[PDB]
Design a binder for this molecule. Sequence first.
Ligand SMILES: Cc1cc2nc3c(=O)[nH]c(=O)nc-3n(C[C@H](O)[C@H](O)[C@H](O)COP(=O)(O)O)c2cc1C
Ligand SMILES: Cc1cc2nc3c(=O)[nH]c(=O)nc-3n(C[C@H](O)[C@H](O)[C@H](O)COP(=O)(O)O)c2cc1C
Ligand code: SF4
Ligand code: SF4
Ligand code: FES
Ligand code: FES
Ligand SMILES: [Cl-]
Ligand SMILES: [Cl-]
Ligand SMILES: [Cl-]
Ligand SMILES: [Cl-]
Ligand code: NA
Ligand code: NA
Ligand code: NA
Ligand code: NA
Ligand code: NA
Ligand code: NA
Ligand code: NA
Ligand code: NA
Lengths: 416, 418, 156, 156
Amino acid sequence: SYPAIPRIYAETTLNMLLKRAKKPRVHSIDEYLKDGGYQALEKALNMSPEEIIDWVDKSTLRGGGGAGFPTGKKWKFAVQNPGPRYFICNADESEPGTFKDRIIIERDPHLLIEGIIISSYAIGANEAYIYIRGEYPAGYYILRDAIEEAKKKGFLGKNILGSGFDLEIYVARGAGAYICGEETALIESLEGKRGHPRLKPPYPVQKGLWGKPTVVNNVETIANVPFIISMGWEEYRYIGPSDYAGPKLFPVSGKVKKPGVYELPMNTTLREVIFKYAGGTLGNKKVKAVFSGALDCFSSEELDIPMDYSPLGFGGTGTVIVLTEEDDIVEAALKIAEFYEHETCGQCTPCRVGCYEQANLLEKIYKGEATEQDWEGFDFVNRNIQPTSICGLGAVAGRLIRQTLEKFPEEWEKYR
Amino acid sequence: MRSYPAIPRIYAETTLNMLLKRAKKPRVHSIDEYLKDGGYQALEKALNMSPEEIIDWVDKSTLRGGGGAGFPTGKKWKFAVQNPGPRYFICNADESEPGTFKDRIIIERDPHLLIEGIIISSYAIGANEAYIYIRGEYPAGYYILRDAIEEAKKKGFLGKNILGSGFDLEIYVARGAGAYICGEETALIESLEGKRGHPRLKPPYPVQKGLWGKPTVVNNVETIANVPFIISMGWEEYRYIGPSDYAGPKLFPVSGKVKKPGVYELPMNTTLREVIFKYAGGTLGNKKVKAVFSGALDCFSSEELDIPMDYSPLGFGGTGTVIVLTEEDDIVEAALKIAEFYEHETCGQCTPCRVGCYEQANLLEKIYKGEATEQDWEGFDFVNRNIQPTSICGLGAVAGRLIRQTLEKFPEEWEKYR
Amino acid sequence: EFEFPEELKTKLQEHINYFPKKRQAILLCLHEIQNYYGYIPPESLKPLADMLELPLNHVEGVVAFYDMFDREDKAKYRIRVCVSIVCHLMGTNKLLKALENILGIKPGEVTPDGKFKIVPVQCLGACSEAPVFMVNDDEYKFESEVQLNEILSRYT
Amino acid sequence: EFEFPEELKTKLQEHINYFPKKRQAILLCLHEIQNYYGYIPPESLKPLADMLELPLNHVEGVVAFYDMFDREDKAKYRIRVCVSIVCHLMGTNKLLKALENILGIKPGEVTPDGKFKIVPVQCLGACSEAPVFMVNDDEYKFESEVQLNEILSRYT
Ligand SMILES: Cc1cc2nc3c(=O)[nH]c(=O)nc-3n(C[C@H](O)[C@H](O)[C@H](O)COP(=O)(O)O)c2cc1C
Ligand SMILES: Cc1cc2nc3c(=O)[nH]c(=O)nc-3n(C[C@H](O)[C@H](O)[C@H](O)COP(=O)(O)O)c2cc1C
Ligand code: SF4
Ligand code: SF4
Ligand code: FES
Ligand code: FES
Ligand SMILES: [Cl-]
Ligand SMILES: [Cl-]
Ligand SMILES: [Cl-]
Ligand SMILES: [Cl-]
Ligand code: NA
Ligand code: NA
Ligand code: NA
Ligand code: NA
Ligand code: NA
Ligand code: NA
Ligand code: NA
Ligand code: NA
């Protein structure tokens, strides 16, 4: 018995990450085993850690937590440093629009657990963590129970399946801070402190949890690992375009007919995501903008881009929030400003004051209460959140809003 | 199927705002609209109750079957569950009796009401497999239902472990292919098994031995559509609707010579007179009512309009199907149409039914066309009285009934033909 | 020697996989065949029976039993006309006359081009909208000849 | 001074023993305390700090930092309403209006009986189901006032 979850729609053309998670219920270990689950683990334990890293490298797998960093490369960096090492699954998923990771957690937890075990083996970590946001209580209980299931079947503990490899997975919960998805703040939180990002470099792979080499990977990234071992890197790389191969998850929301999570190859276009897969727009109204979570704003002239990590690609977490022709861009920008105001950790002065002022002033603009000085101030602050920032939040808190100012000047001009 | 086949926009009107709350508007109501009205909350409440409790509630509600026989629904379920599983649940959407078009408007306009009722009912009797058997001539309803089931699946109301309850259900949609007899519950089962629609000797009843010989509940569309209301309101509040011995909503498909033909949701204390004159707007041209045909089952004269639309001995009963004939309508011509129906629908297993349904129509046609001998007249009388013997289903039992009533109630018109 | 086109075969296989037991799909399969060919070709029953793992005898009996299926006449559009009590009372005969005027055929007949067949049927469960007809899956109230002519113009 | 009831102290001890180091259990402990009391009692932090082997100052700062924790208002049921972009677009305001109609309170307020508190929150990660709300750990899409009323009726 778990807390009530809304039944998010999920659809796949690849039948990999969403093979089970396309059905909105918990798939327990017996059902996972019937589908051939945990045989990739068994295969992996018969391979060298080095060989696993090599396959993951050659698969072209990239991080699903927003930056698209090559996973194998990350793991290679970690294992160049003396142990012990730690493995962390980032399940903080708190960016607006983004709900892809929870459906793996809540519906196919063993896919994630199997990937964690393989990944931990690959990097020589005997202690792994899942850090799940506090607002995912059902996912937390589901994972705790699935870990117990895995222990009882001998996939966790000491000397897993006679391999001599030991692993414990600990589940930690967040408590309301978006910034705890930033990998160094996550580590700080795991250490029992406030979620304050650390200056990088050093990257976690050099100095992470308790100062030791630590790999942080996103839920989606890790859920790919069992497929790479199962299929081999060649067949994996045959999925989608050769340079951005493999499945990707796309959480689509807002003004579409079929909001939900889509498992698609990365040669799919943004237009296809919206019209081919997500059923087109509510009321068949014209697309005005797509917000890539709280990161970017694409206009209706930019729909033909691929959902890959190329320079002209959509990139990120594949988060697609659709606004149509009647949606007020300034109102929407205010919501993005409010998010950053609520999430800056306050360590860096331009971020602390900038995220606050951006929202404060934009609220005045929206309500028709802004002076000429408020307008000029808003413009200045928007451009000056990033200086001295030590993490990506300060670097991007003004980015989406600036794009709206450039791409929808007429609507902003009306707020005069 | 974003686009469905064309359907006539049957008029629908309700004084109770239950079964026709959405189906009074002639269009498909999809799951979002259904959820906005509180849909599927009854399912949620049901899954927190024991199956035993749901049966008890449906029993105490006084709900009766809307497929013609008015059998107490909760009692039917109790009979099924006293037999070992697995059990099956079947929604009868064969609706093919002349005059009868009540079930289709629920299917085509408010499919989730039916689906929700199927899920609750299936849970109540412990069935993990349910069927809807829809007549072949309702293609729109079929596509609408297939699509609505997928919607329900997407929202987690169907499949395994529905809403964490541990209850599994799949609903399969089967199509008929032109036989009225496949509405008879045992022929329906034969058809579901891939055979001809031949009724089985009863007993055993389906609740004992049905689909693949296992306990099976067959219930009519209308019956099932009541179930969410019983759970939502509770049996006591439901029983407060209409007369306490025949409580809750009933659907009345009214057709023929009325100004407002269509489906009426009304309480069962409504009289036949009220159905025609208060609700269906009176008669075309304000002509006098001559007769009402209760589908192809009964003929009521103009002296019988003050009866209640309930399942009492002096009530209208049946499926509440009201076909109005007025003063200029030839009763013999009408009787012939009824004979032709039974001629076309006997399955032929039973000899008096097979030959009697055929001869009744053959001879009545001769009578109507003025080509009947004295022997044909006497033969027609005899055959009409002798369709029932040895019959194993209701069709043979009733194929002569309406016509006999017209012979008794309208002798002067028949005499004109003789 | 008779074989189902791949696209039909695929649809048949889908129906056969839909129910728990293959034989339950027999009516859905026959509907699909009639949809594809405009009738049930006699030669189709043998391979269908094989797919359902049923004797041919069984399949032939089912086809014969169910009135919607037609083994005799190919037609692109079946105009199903209700000839039961309510439609008769409210104007089946006017509909049949309008059809004869427009198409030149009577119940049971097919136009010379194979396009339309008039099929007299029992009550279609739309009696309030009498007199009722279908054109394949589409169903309509008959109002008048001009109205019917417009409706039929949509089927080409 | 304050001391935890034994059954709570047991649960806190389980969390503290779960991770390799005691201090890692701080957030699990605070969730447990908030679950137990309907808020974080100021007086609970000193004994918690002792069990975690942490300075009180450290614990106070953590409570202040993490937005899920509430030291001010006791409530049996927290109604967390998403006020972020997608829910706003798709009808946060309708949900809030429905909540005010049913409960008589606005965001930040507690009902007089201490039963419900409306807590505005950032994106709950269920944006396809906008507008989203939670009632304690349970999460729902808001469809309508009638639908919401029935959901809330489940919490006594
Ligand atoms: C403000 C901020 C929030 C982030 N939130 C998340 C998050 O919720 N989940 C996640 O996996 N990565 C998040 N990241 C990115 C992580 O720091 C990190 O790059 C990622 O977890 C690495 O795993 P990957 O390579 O598999 O993507 C966030 C980064 C920043 C700057
Ligand atoms: C010839 C014949 C045809 C029938 N047609 C139907 C029909 O189309 N729909 C229906 O639900 N019941 C029909 N019935 C009644 C069913 O056998 C059965 O009583 C009913 O489906 C049980 O459900 P209920 O108790 O909800 O009415 C028919 C019965 C006979 C004898
Ligand atoms: S950039 Fe902003 S969120 Fe990141 S460490 Fe600095 S103040 Fe905190
Ligand atoms: S009574 Fe008539 S319809 Fe019923 S089984 Fe016998 S022949 Fe068939
Ligand atoms: S009598 Fe023709 S549709 Fe019913
Ligand atoms: S914006 Fe409300 S759940 Fe994401
Ligand atoms: Cl191996
Ligand atoms: Cl005539
Ligand atoms: Cl054979
Ligand atoms: Cl101290
Ligand atoms: Na989920
Ligand atoms: Na968090
Ligand atoms: Na913060
Ligand atoms: Na019927
Ligand atoms: Na309808
Ligand atoms: Na089954
Ligand atoms: Na039928
Ligand atoms: Na029965």
